Amino acid sequence: QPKAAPSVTLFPPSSEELQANKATLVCLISDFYPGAVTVAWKADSSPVNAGVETTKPSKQSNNKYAASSYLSLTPEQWKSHKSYSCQVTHEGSTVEKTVAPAESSENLYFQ
């Protein structure tokens, strides 16, 4: 069970939660340590740490563990920035990603 570099994938909030004034970030993590990592997030200027849920990992076809984190914040908080970044700690290594999600998609509106 050697070292495994985790993946980083940021996704926009769901319309279901958005409509109700809510946004939950999703961080896809695969091919990493055996359920051993550090959950961390980064916002526009103010970095995040607490208020994030972590679901138990799961072995893959290659025995590689896969997990994901969820950030609990308002829809306006994320909407303030163009894209979010998910910090993934591994073997003493931390990396973040940045990508702006589609706009055409439905967002927080007057239900």
XYZ file of all heavy atoms in Angstrom:
843
model
N 0.827 -1.201 0.000
C 0.000 0.000 0.000
C 0.865 1.257 0.000
O 0.953 1.979 0.993
C -0.929 0.006 1.216
C -1.924 -1.142 1.225
C -2.760 -1.201 -0.037
O -2.956 -2.269 -0.618
N -3.260 -0.049 -0.471
N 1.520 1.525 -1.139
C 2.389 2.695 -1.296
C 1.604 4.001 -1.325
O 0.394 4.015 -1.103
C 3.073 2.450 -2.645
C 2.128 1.574 -3.394
C 1.461 0.707 -2.362
N 2.302 5.099 -1.600
C 1.670 6.412 -1.660
C 0.804 6.542 -2.909
O 1.122 5.982 -3.957
C 2.733 7.513 -1.646
C 2.167 8.907 -1.851
C 2.258 9.336 -3.307
C 1.552 10.662 -3.542
N 2.128 11.399 -4.701
N -0.291 7.285 -2.788
C -1.201 7.491 -3.908
C -1.646 8.948 -3.992
O -2.184 9.498 -3.032
C -2.409 6.575 -3.784
N -1.420 9.566 -5.146
C -1.798 10.957 -5.356
C -3.298 11.086 -5.607
O -3.832 10.578 -6.592
C -1.015 11.549 -6.517
N -3.993 11.781 -4.694
C -5.440 11.992 -4.795
C -5.811 12.933 -5.937
O -4.969 13.678 -6.438
C -5.801 12.622 -3.446
C -4.544 13.273 -2.984
C -3.420 12.415 -3.495
N -7.075 12.893 -6.343
C -7.556 13.738 -7.430
C -8.277 14.967 -6.882
O -8.694 14.992 -5.724
C -8.495 12.947 -8.342
O -8.483 13.469 -9.660
N -8.420 15.985 -7.726
C -9.090 17.217 -7.328
C -10.083 17.670 -8.394
O -9.699 18.003 -9.516
C -8.079 18.349 -7.070
C -8.747 19.509 -6.348
C -6.890 17.830 -6.275
N -11.363 17.684 -8.035
C -12.412 18.095 -8.959
C -13.490 18.901 -8.245
O -14.184 18.386 -7.366
C -13.064 16.880 -9.646
O -12.213 15.735 -9.528
C -13.334 17.169 -11.115
N -13.627 20.166 -8.625
C -14.624 21.043 -8.020
C -15.889 21.096 -8.869
O -15.825 21.148 -10.098
C -14.052 22.452 -7.846
C -12.821 22.571 -6.947
C -12.993 21.728 -5.693
C -11.567 22.157 -7.703
N -17.041 21.087 -8.206
C -18.323 21.136 -8.900
C -19.258 22.149 -8.245
O -19.219 22.376 -7.035
C -18.977 19.752 -8.905
C -18.084 18.670 -9.443
C -17.416 17.814 -8.582
C -17.914 18.509 -10.808
C -16.594 16.818 -9.075
C -17.094 17.514 -11.306
C -16.434 16.667 -10.438
N -20.118 22.773 -9.061
C -21.079 23.773 -8.586
C -22.183 23.157 -7.734
O -22.353 21.938 -7.682
C -21.661 24.351 -9.879
C -21.488 23.269 -10.888
C -20.220 22.552 -10.514
N -22.954 24.015 -7.051
C -24.057 23.576 -6.190
C -25.226 23.009 -6.989
O -25.387 23.312 -8.171
C -24.474 24.859 -5.467
C -24.058 25.961 -6.380
C -22.809 25.480 -7.066
N -26.040 22.186 -6.336
C -27.192 21.575 -6.986
C -28.371 22.542 -7.023
O -28.569 23.333 -6.101
C -27.594 20.290 -6.259
O -26.915 19.168 -6.794
N -29.153 22.471 -8.096
C -30.312 23.343 -8.257
C -31.291 23.162 -7.101
O -31.924 24.119 -6.655
C -31.013 23.055 -9.585
O -31.938 21.990 -9.453
N -31.411 21.928 -6.622
C -32.314 21.621 -5.520
C -32.005 22.491 -4.305
O -32.894 23.131 -3.745
C -32.210 20.142 -5.142
C -32.343 19.200 -6.328
C -32.741 17.796 -5.915
O -33.913 17.601 -5.528
O -31.881 16.894 -5.979
N -30.738 22.505 -3.903
C -30.311 23.295 -2.753
C -30.252 24.778 -3.104
O -30.599 25.636 -2.289
C -28.942 22.822 -2.261
C -27.866 22.854 -3.333
C -26.512 22.407 -2.814
O -26.229 22.637 -1.620
O -25.737 21.828 -3.603
N -29.811 25.076 -4.321
C -29.706 26.456 -4.780
C -31.053 27.165 -4.690
O -31.144 28.283 -4.184
C -29.193 26.497 -6.221
C -27.686 26.300 -6.402
C -27.329 26.251 -7.879
C -26.916 27.409 -5.701
N -32.098 26.505 -5.180
C -33.441 27.072 -5.152
C -33.853 27.426 -3.726
O -34.574 28.397 -3.502
C -34.445 26.090 -5.757
C -34.264 25.878 -7.251
C -35.532 26.149 -8.036
O -36.613 25.689 -7.670
N -35.405 26.902 -9.123
N -33.390 26.630 -2.767
C -33.710 26.860 -1.364
C -32.636 27.706 -0.689
O -32.534 27.733 0.537
C -33.875 25.533 -0.637
N -31.838 28.396 -1.496
C -30.771 29.243 -0.976
C -29.725 28.411 -0.242
O -29.506 28.582 0.957
C -31.346 30.303 -0.034
C -30.361 31.420 0.250
O -29.564 31.794 -0.612
N -30.411 31.959 1.462
N -29.078 27.506 -0.972
C -28.052 26.647 -0.393
C -27.094 26.144 -1.468
O -27.496 25.899 -2.605
C -28.698 25.461 0.325
C -28.799 25.641 1.830
C -30.215 25.991 2.255
C -31.051 24.743 2.492
N -32.213 25.013 3.383
N -25.826 25.993 -1.100
C -24.812 25.515 -2.031
C -23.847 24.552 -1.347
O -23.350 24.827 -0.255
C -24.053 26.689 -2.632
N -23.585 23.423 -1.997
C -22.683 22.418 -1.451
C -21.631 22.009 -2.476
O -21.950 21.411 -3.503
C -23.449 21.163 -0.990
O -24.427 21.521 -0.007
C -22.495 20.129 -0.411
N -20.375 22.334 -2.189
C -19.274 22.000 -3.087
C -18.963 20.508 -3.035
O -19.140 19.861 -2.001
C -18.027 22.805 -2.718
C -18.030 24.276 -3.136
C -18.265 24.405 -4.632
C -19.086 25.049 -2.359
N -18.499 19.965 -4.156
C -18.160 18.550 -4.237
C -16.721 18.355 -4.701
O -16.323 18.856 -5.752
C -19.104 17.802 -5.198
C -18.726 16.331 -5.279
C -20.551 17.967 -4.759
N -15.944 17.623 -3.909
C -14.549 17.360 -4.238
C -14.324 15.876 -4.512
O -14.358 15.052 -3.596
C -13.640 17.823 -3.097
S -11.863 17.782 -3.500
N -14.093 15.541 -5.776
C -13.863 14.156 -6.172
C -12.430 13.734 -5.866
O -11.476 14.348 -6.346
C -14.152 13.976 -7.663
C -15.371 13.121 -8.012
C -15.210 11.713 -7.456
C -16.644 13.763 -7.482
N -12.285 12.683 -5.066
C -10.969 12.177 -4.700
C -10.850 10.687 -5.000
O -11.637 9.880 -4.507
C -10.669 12.415 -3.209
C -10.785 13.904 -2.875
C -9.284 11.895 -2.857
C -11.511 14.177 -1.576
N -9.858 10.329 -5.809
C -9.635 8.935 -6.176
C -8.144 8.634 -6.291
O -7.330 9.539 -6.481
C -10.335 8.616 -7.499
O -10.480 9.781 -8.293
N -7.794 7.358 -6.174
C -6.401 6.937 -6.267
C -5.546 7.654 -5.226
O -4.593 8.354 -5.567
C -5.854 7.209 -7.669
C -4.473 6.620 -7.876
O -3.905 6.082 -6.903
O -3.961 6.696 -9.012
N -5.894 7.475 -3.956
C -5.160 8.107 -2.866
C -4.938 7.125 -1.720
O -5.355 5.969 -1.788
C -5.916 9.336 -2.359
C -7.074 9.001 -1.463
C -6.921 8.994 -0.085
C -8.315 8.693 -1.997
C -7.985 8.685 0.742
C -9.383 8.383 -1.175
C -9.217 8.379 0.197
N -4.276 7.594 -0.667
C -3.995 6.756 0.493
C -5.233 5.971 0.912
O -6.356 6.264 0.499
C -3.503 7.615 1.660
C -1.997 7.722 1.741
C -1.380 8.940 1.993
C -1.192 6.603 1.568
C -0.005 9.042 2.068
C 0.184 6.695 1.641
C 0.774 7.917 1.892
O 2.145 8.014 1.966
N -5.026 4.946 1.752
C -6.113 4.096 2.248
C -7.030 4.834 3.216
O -7.102 4.497 4.398
C -5.377 2.962 2.965
C -4.068 3.551 3.362
C -3.715 4.538 2.285
N -7.732 5.842 2.709
C -8.636 6.612 3.544
C -7.904 7.571 4.461
O -8.443 7.998 5.481
N -6.671 7.908 4.098
C -5.864 8.823 4.896
C -5.598 10.122 4.141
O -4.767 10.165 3.233
C -4.551 8.163 5.290
N -6.310 11.179 4.521
C -6.150 12.478 3.881
C -6.660 13.599 4.779
O -7.264 13.349 5.822
C -6.895 12.535 2.533
C -6.048 11.920 1.429
C -8.240 11.833 2.639
N -6.413 14.839 4.366
C -6.846 16.000 5.133
C -7.872 16.819 4.358
O -7.621 17.242 3.230
C -5.656 16.907 5.501
O -4.537 16.106 5.898
C -6.030 17.859 6.628
N -9.031 17.041 4.971
C -10.095 17.811 4.339
C -9.877 19.308 4.529
O -9.854 19.805 5.656
C -11.476 17.428 4.904
C -11.494 17.578 6.418
C -12.566 18.275 4.264
N -9.719 20.023 3.420
C -9.505 21.464 3.465
C -10.034 22.136 2.202
O -9.968 21.570 1.112
C -8.027 21.773 3.649
N -10.561 23.346 2.358
C -11.103 24.094 1.229
C -10.542 25.512 1.198
O -10.037 26.014 2.201
C -12.629 24.138 1.305
C -13.277 22.816 1.021
C -13.412 21.768 1.885
C -13.874 22.402 -0.213
N -14.058 20.726 1.262
C -14.352 21.091 -0.025
C -14.052 23.013 -1.457
C -14.996 20.382 -1.036
C -14.691 22.307 -2.459
C -15.158 21.004 -2.243
N -10.634 26.153 0.037
C -10.137 27.515 -0.125
C -11.148 28.377 -0.874
O -11.572 28.037 -1.979
C -8.804 27.507 -0.877
C -8.370 28.880 -1.359
C -8.004 29.790 -0.199
C -6.579 29.546 0.274
N -5.579 30.175 -0.632
N -11.532 29.495 -0.266
C -12.490 30.407 -0.875
C -11.789 31.626 -1.467
O -10.593 31.828 -1.258
C -13.532 30.839 0.145
N -12.541 32.434 -2.206
C -11.991 33.633 -2.827
C -10.719 34.080 -2.115
O -9.611 33.742 -2.531
C -13.024 34.762 -2.809
C -12.434 36.093 -3.231
O -11.484 36.091 -4.041
O -12.920 37.137 -2.749
N -10.885 34.842 -1.039
C -9.750 35.340 -0.271
C -9.677 34.660 1.093
O -8.592 34.387 1.606
C -9.852 36.856 -0.094
O -8.610 37.406 0.311
N -10.841 34.392 1.676
C -10.911 33.749 2.983
C -10.995 32.232 2.839
O -11.982 31.683 2.348
C -12.120 34.265 3.765
O -12.040 33.896 5.131
N -9.934 31.537 3.274
C -9.862 30.074 3.204
C -10.825 29.400 4.175
O -11.135 29.943 5.236
C -8.413 29.771 3.592
C -7.992 30.934 4.424
C -8.722 32.126 3.869
N -11.297 28.214 3.805
C -12.225 27.464 4.644
C -11.554 26.231 5.238
O -10.576 25.720 4.694
C -13.471 27.027 3.851
C -14.550 26.516 4.793
C -13.992 28.175 3.001
N -12.088 25.755 6.359
C -11.541 24.580 7.028
C -12.652 23.750 7.664
O -12.766 22.551 7.414
C -10.528 25.000 8.094
C -9.115 25.078 7.550
O -8.758 26.024 6.847
N -8.301 24.079 7.872
N -13.469 24.399 8.488
C -14.572 23.722 9.159
C -15.861 23.843 8.353
O -15.943 24.625 7.407
C -14.767 24.290 10.557
N -16.867 23.060 8.734
C -18.138 23.095 8.034
C -18.133 22.243 6.780
O -18.838 22.541 5.816
N -17.335 21.181 6.791
C -17.240 20.284 5.646
C -17.421 18.831 6.069
O -16.793 18.368 7.021
C -15.886 20.433 4.927
C -14.747 20.007 5.840
C -15.877 19.625 3.637
N -18.284 18.115 5.355
C -18.548 16.713 5.658
C -17.651 15.799 4.827
O -17.350 16.090 3.669
C -20.018 16.379 5.396
C -20.986 17.399 5.972
C -20.932 17.463 7.486
O -20.371 16.533 8.100
O -21.453 18.445 8.056
N -17.226 14.691 5.428
C -16.363 13.735 4.747
C -16.946 12.328 4.807
O -17.118 11.761 5.886
C -14.949 13.720 5.359
O -14.163 12.692 4.747
C -15.012 13.490 6.861
N -17.249 11.768 3.640
C -17.812 10.426 3.559
C -16.714 9.370 3.505
O -15.677 9.569 2.871
C -18.719 10.271 2.325
O -19.358 8.990 2.343
C -17.918 10.425 1.041
N -16.948 8.245 4.172
C -15.980 7.155 4.199
C -15.557 6.769 2.785
O -16.355 6.778 1.847
C -16.570 5.938 4.915
C -16.412 5.987 6.425
C -14.983 5.690 6.846
C -14.899 5.335 8.323
N -15.037 3.870 8.550
N -14.272 6.421 2.625
C -13.714 6.023 1.329
C -14.240 4.671 0.862
O -15.064 4.048 1.533
C -12.209 5.947 1.598
C -12.099 5.682 3.060
C -13.264 6.388 3.698
N -13.759 4.220 -0.292
C -14.185 2.942 -0.851
C -13.140 2.400 -1.822
O -12.686 3.106 -2.723
C -15.530 3.095 -1.564
O -16.508 3.638 -0.695
N -12.763 1.140 -1.632
C -11.774 0.499 -2.490
C -12.230 0.505 -3.945
O -13.423 0.402 -4.231
C -11.524 -0.939 -2.029
C -10.089 -1.399 -2.225
C -10.019 -2.886 -2.537
C -10.618 -3.197 -3.900
N -11.456 -4.429 -3.867
N -11.273 0.626 -4.860
C -11.578 0.644 -6.286
C -11.125 -0.648 -6.957
O -10.662 -1.575 -6.291
C -10.906 1.844 -6.957
C -11.553 3.176 -6.612
C -12.826 3.427 -7.396
O -12.989 2.931 -8.512
N -13.737 4.198 -6.816
N -11.262 -0.702 -8.278
C -10.870 -1.884 -9.038
C -9.376 -2.153 -8.893
O -8.928 -3.295 -8.981
C -11.229 -1.707 -10.515
O -10.602 -2.697 -11.313
N -8.609 -1.091 -8.671
C -7.164 -1.209 -8.516
C -6.767 -1.124 -7.044
O -5.623 -0.815 -6.717
C -6.452 -0.115 -9.312
C -7.416 0.912 -9.874
O -8.222 0.605 -10.753
N -7.337 2.137 -9.369
N -7.721 -1.402 -6.163
C -7.472 -1.357 -4.726
C -7.290 0.081 -4.251
O -7.068 0.332 -3.066
C -6.232 -2.183 -4.377
C -5.195 -1.377 -3.620
O -5.086 -1.475 -2.398
N -4.427 -0.572 -4.346
N -7.384 1.023 -5.183
C -7.230 2.437 -4.861
C -8.456 2.962 -4.119
O -9.592 2.726 -4.533
C -7.007 3.250 -6.138
C -5.542 3.464 -6.474
C -4.765 2.159 -6.437
C -3.351 2.337 -6.969
N -3.220 1.850 -8.370
N -8.218 3.674 -3.023
C -9.303 4.230 -2.224
C -9.844 5.509 -2.856
O -9.093 6.299 -3.426
C -8.820 4.517 -0.801
C -8.933 3.329 0.127
C -8.588 2.053 -0.301
C -9.386 3.483 1.432
C -8.691 0.964 0.543
C -9.490 2.400 2.284
C -9.142 1.143 1.835
O -9.245 0.062 2.680
N -11.155 5.704 -2.750
C -11.799 6.888 -3.308
C -12.754 7.519 -2.301
O -13.580 6.833 -1.699
C -12.539 6.530 -4.588
N -12.634 8.830 -2.122
C -13.488 9.555 -1.189
C -13.925 10.895 -1.770
O -13.576 11.234 -2.901
C -12.767 9.762 0.135
N -14.689 11.653 -0.990
C -15.177 12.955 -1.431
C -15.612 13.803 -0.239
O -16.110 13.282 0.758
C -16.345 12.783 -2.403
O -16.878 11.472 -2.333
N -15.418 15.113 -0.351
C -15.787 16.035 0.716
C -16.897 16.977 0.263
O -17.052 17.243 -0.930
C -14.567 16.843 1.164
O -13.774 16.106 2.078
N -17.668 17.478 1.222
C -18.767 18.389 0.921
C -18.715 19.619 1.821
O -18.731 19.508 3.048
C -20.109 17.675 1.090
C -20.270 16.469 0.193
C -19.809 15.219 0.586
C -20.886 16.579 -1.048
C -19.953 14.114 -0.231
C -21.037 15.479 -1.870
C -20.569 14.250 -1.457
O -20.716 13.152 -2.274
N -18.654 20.795 1.203
C -18.601 22.048 1.947
C -19.999 22.628 2.136
O -20.746 22.799 1.172
C -17.711 23.057 1.220
C -16.995 24.079 2.104
C -17.994 24.821 2.979
C -15.937 23.397 2.959
N -20.344 22.933 3.382
C -21.653 23.494 3.698
C -21.576 25.012 3.828
O -21.146 25.537 4.856
C -22.194 22.886 4.993
O -22.254 21.472 4.906
N -21.996 25.712 2.780
C -21.976 27.170 2.775
C -23.139 27.728 1.961
O -23.841 26.987 1.271
C -20.650 27.679 2.207
C -20.119 26.943 0.977
C -21.043 27.157 -0.212
C -18.707 27.403 0.648
N -23.336 29.040 2.043
C -24.412 29.699 1.313
C -24.094 29.788 -0.175
O -22.938 29.708 -0.593
C -24.674 31.117 1.856
O -23.744 32.041 1.281
C -24.554 31.145 3.372
N -25.140 29.958 -0.996
C -24.996 30.063 -2.451
C -24.327 31.366 -2.874
O -23.706 31.438 -3.934
C -26.441 30.015 -2.954
C -27.257 30.513 -1.813
C -26.545 30.061 -0.567
N -24.458 32.392 -2.040
C -23.866 33.693 -2.330
C -22.366 33.681 -2.050
O -21.596 34.375 -2.712
C -24.543 34.784 -1.498
C -24.467 34.541 0.000
C -25.000 35.710 0.807
O -25.644 36.598 0.210
O -24.775 35.735 2.035
N -21.960 32.889 -1.064
C -20.553 32.789 -0.694
C -19.712 32.318 -1.876
O -18.705 32.938 -2.221
C -20.379 31.829 0.484
C -20.527 32.499 1.841
C -19.254 32.444 2.660
O -18.764 33.469 3.137
N -18.709 31.245 2.830
N -20.132 31.219 -2.493
C -19.416 30.664 -3.637
C -19.622 31.527 -4.878
O -18.700 31.723 -5.670
C -19.883 29.234 -3.912
C -20.507 29.063 -5.263
C -21.836 28.903 -5.539
C -19.828 29.031 -6.523
N -22.023 28.775 -6.894
C -20.808 28.850 -7.521
C -18.489 29.140 -6.907
C -20.487 28.775 -8.873
C -18.172 29.064 -8.250
C -19.167 28.885 -9.221
N -20.837 32.040 -5.041
C -21.165 32.883 -6.185
C -20.281 34.126 -6.215
O -20.117 34.757 -7.259
C -22.638 33.293 -6.137
C -23.549 32.381 -6.942
C -24.288 33.149 -8.026
C -23.347 33.585 -9.140
N -24.021 33.584 -10.467
N -19.713 34.472 -5.064
C -18.848 35.640 -4.958
C -17.568 35.443 -5.765
O -17.036 36.390 -6.347
C -18.503 35.915 -3.493
O -18.367 37.306 -3.253
N -17.079 34.209 -5.795
C -15.862 33.885 -6.531
C -16.192 33.192 -7.849
O -17.286 32.657 -8.026
C -14.951 32.995 -5.686
C -13.502 33.107 -6.045
N -12.588 32.100 -5.814
C -12.809 34.115 -6.627
C -11.396 32.485 -6.234
N -11.503 33.703 -6.732
N -15.237 33.205 -8.774
C -15.424 32.576 -10.075
C -15.379 31.056 -9.958
O -16.172 30.352 -10.584
C -14.350 33.055 -11.055
C -14.172 34.563 -11.072
C -14.054 35.095 -12.491
C -12.608 35.103 -12.965
N -12.511 35.120 -14.451
N -14.447 30.557 -9.154
C -14.297 29.120 -8.956
C -13.704 28.819 -7.583
O -12.986 29.638 -7.011
C -13.408 28.523 -10.049
O -13.771 29.014 -11.328
N -14.013 27.638 -7.059
C -13.514 27.227 -5.752
C -12.299 26.317 -5.893
O -11.911 25.948 -7.001
C -14.614 26.512 -4.965
C -15.239 27.364 -3.885
C -15.485 28.716 -4.094
C -15.582 26.819 -2.654
C -16.055 29.499 -3.110
C -16.155 27.594 -1.664
C -16.389 28.934 -1.896
O -16.957 29.710 -0.912
N -11.701 25.958 -4.761
C -10.527 25.094 -4.757
C -10.566 24.131 -3.574
O -10.773 24.540 -2.431
C -9.250 25.932 -4.705
O -9.375 27.103 -5.494
N -10.364 22.848 -3.856
C -10.375 21.825 -2.818
C -8.958 21.364 -2.492
O -8.251 20.844 -3.354
C -11.223 20.630 -3.259
S -11.147 19.205 -2.126
N -8.551 21.559 -1.242
C -7.218 21.165 -0.803
C -7.189 19.692 -0.408
O -8.005 19.238 0.393
C -6.769 22.031 0.376
C -7.297 23.455 0.321
C -6.957 24.154 -0.980
O -5.787 24.286 -1.340
N -7.981 24.606 -1.695
N -6.243 18.951 -0.975
C -6.106 17.529 -0.682
C -4.702 17.202 -0.188
O -3.733 17.273 -0.944
C -6.417 16.668 -1.921
C -7.918 16.580 -2.148
C -5.716 17.230 -3.149
N -4.598 16.842 1.088
C -3.312 16.505 1.684
C -2.952 15.045 1.427
O -3.778 14.151 1.616
C -3.312 16.761 3.203
O -3.549 18.149 3.465
C -1.988 16.342 3.823
N -1.717 14.812 0.997
C -1.249 13.460 0.715
C 0.269 13.374 0.836
O 0.996 14.133 0.196
C -1.685 13.026 -0.685
C -1.171 13.917 -1.774
N -1.707 15.158 -2.047
C -0.163 13.741 -2.660
C -1.051 15.705 -3.055
N -0.109 14.866 -3.444
N 0.742 12.446 1.663
C 2.173 12.264 1.868
C 2.864 13.604 2.103
O 4.001 13.812 1.681
C 2.799 11.559 0.663
C 2.830 12.415 -0.593
C 3.827 11.910 -1.618
O 4.580 10.966 -1.299
O 3.854 12.459 -2.739
N 2.168 14.513 2.780
C 2.728 15.822 3.058
C 2.675 16.744 1.856
O 3.475 17.672 1.741
N 1.731 16.485 0.957
C 1.580 17.296 -0.247
C 0.157 17.834 -0.363
O -0.815 17.088 -0.239
C 1.930 16.474 -1.488
O 3.282 16.049 -1.456
N 0.042 19.137 -0.602
C -1.260 19.778 -0.735
C -1.389 20.489 -2.078
O -0.499 21.238 -2.482
C -1.504 20.793 0.397
O -0.645 21.927 0.231
C -1.257 20.158 1.757
N -2.502 20.250 -2.764
C -2.748 20.869 -4.061
C -4.192 21.343 -4.178
O -5.092 20.780 -3.556
C -2.442 19.897 -5.214
C -1.032 19.343 -5.088
C -3.465 18.770 -5.246
N -4.405 22.382 -4.981
C -5.741 22.931 -5.180
C -6.048 23.092 -6.666
O -5.140 23.165 -7.495
C -5.872 24.281 -4.471
C -5.567 25.469 -5.366
C -5.119 26.689 -4.583
O -5.772 27.016 -3.570
O -4.116 27.317 -4.984
N -7.333 23.147 -6.996
C -7.762 23.300 -8.381
C -8.687 24.504 -8.535
O -9.270 24.981 -7.561
C -8.475 22.032 -8.860
C -7.585 21.104 -9.668
C -7.224 21.710 -11.014
C -8.442 21.828 -11.917
N -8.228 21.150 -13.226
N -8.817 24.991 -9.765
C -9.670 26.138 -10.046
C -10.330 26.011 -11.414
O -9.651 25.956 -12.439
C -8.875 27.457 -9.992
O -8.186 27.562 -8.742
C -9.797 28.653 -10.171
N -11.658 25.967 -11.424
C -12.410 25.848 -12.668
C -13.806 26.446 -12.526
O -14.543 26.115 -11.598
C -12.536 24.378 -13.109
C -11.221 23.879 -13.688
C -12.979 23.508 -11.942
N -14.161 27.331 -13.452
C -15.469 27.975 -13.432
C -16.523 27.096 -14.096
O -16.429 26.756 -15.276
C -15.400 29.330 -14.118
N -17.551 26.717 -13.324
C -18.644 25.873 -13.817
C -19.535 26.602 -14.815
O -19.526 27.832 -14.888
C -19.429 25.532 -12.548
C -19.137 26.651 -11.609
C -17.728 27.085 -11.909
N -20.305 25.838 -15.583
C -21.204 26.412 -16.576
C -22.103 27.475 -15.953
O -22.347 27.465 -14.747
C -22.044 25.321 -17.221
N -22.591 28.392 -16.783
C -23.462 29.463 -16.312
C -24.910 29.206 -16.720
O -25.840 29.533 -15.983
C -22.995 30.810 -16.865
C -21.495 31.026 -16.756
C -21.054 32.358 -17.333
O -20.966 32.465 -18.574
O -20.798 33.291 -16.545
N -25.091 28.620 -17.899
C -26.425 28.324 -18.409
C -27.242 27.556 -17.374
O -28.456 27.739 -17.266
C -26.331 27.516 -19.703
O -26.090 28.360 -20.815
N -26.570 26.695 -16.617
C -27.234 25.897 -15.593
C -28.071 26.779 -14.674
O -27.759 27.951 -14.468
C -26.202 25.119 -14.774
O -26.799 24.016 -14.116
N -29.136 26.205 -14.121
C -30.019 26.940 -13.224
C -29.355 27.161 -11.867
O -28.669 26.281 -11.350
C -31.339 26.187 -13.041
C -31.158 24.735 -12.631
C -32.468 24.067 -12.260
O -33.250 24.676 -11.500
O -32.712 22.935 -12.729
N -29.564 28.343 -11.298
C -28.984 28.681 -10.003
C -30.052 29.211 -9.051
O -31.248 29.136 -9.338
C -27.876 29.722 -10.173
C -26.713 29.488 -9.228
O -26.781 29.824 -8.046
N -25.637 28.906 -9.747
N -29.614 29.747 -7.918
C -30.532 30.289 -6.922
C -31.500 31.281 -7.558
O -31.089 32.317 -8.081
C -29.751 30.971 -5.797
C -30.551 31.917 -4.901
C -30.143 31.748 -3.446
C -30.362 33.360 -5.347
N -32.788 30.959 -7.507
C -33.815 31.822 -8.078
C -35.038 31.887 -7.170
O -35.123 31.174 -6.170
C -34.220 31.317 -9.464
C -34.626 32.422 -10.415
C -33.774 33.488 -10.676
C -35.860 32.397 -11.053
C -34.141 34.498 -11.544
C -36.235 33.403 -11.923
C -35.372 34.451 -12.164
O -35.741 35.456 -13.031
N -35.987 32.747 -7.526
C -37.207 32.907 -6.744
C -38.186 31.772 -7.026
O -38.885 31.778 -8.038
C -37.865 34.253 -7.056
C -39.026 34.574 -6.160
C -38.834 35.277 -4.981
C -40.310 34.174 -6.494
C -39.900 35.575 -4.153
C -41.380 34.470 -5.671
C -41.175 35.169 -4.499
N -38.230 30.798 -6.122
C -39.122 29.654 -6.273
C -40.580 30.083 -6.149
O -41.493 29.273 -6.322
C -38.800 28.588 -5.226
C -39.257 28.955 -3.823
C -40.662 28.470 -3.521
O -41.562 29.267 -3.255
N -40.857 27.156 -3.563
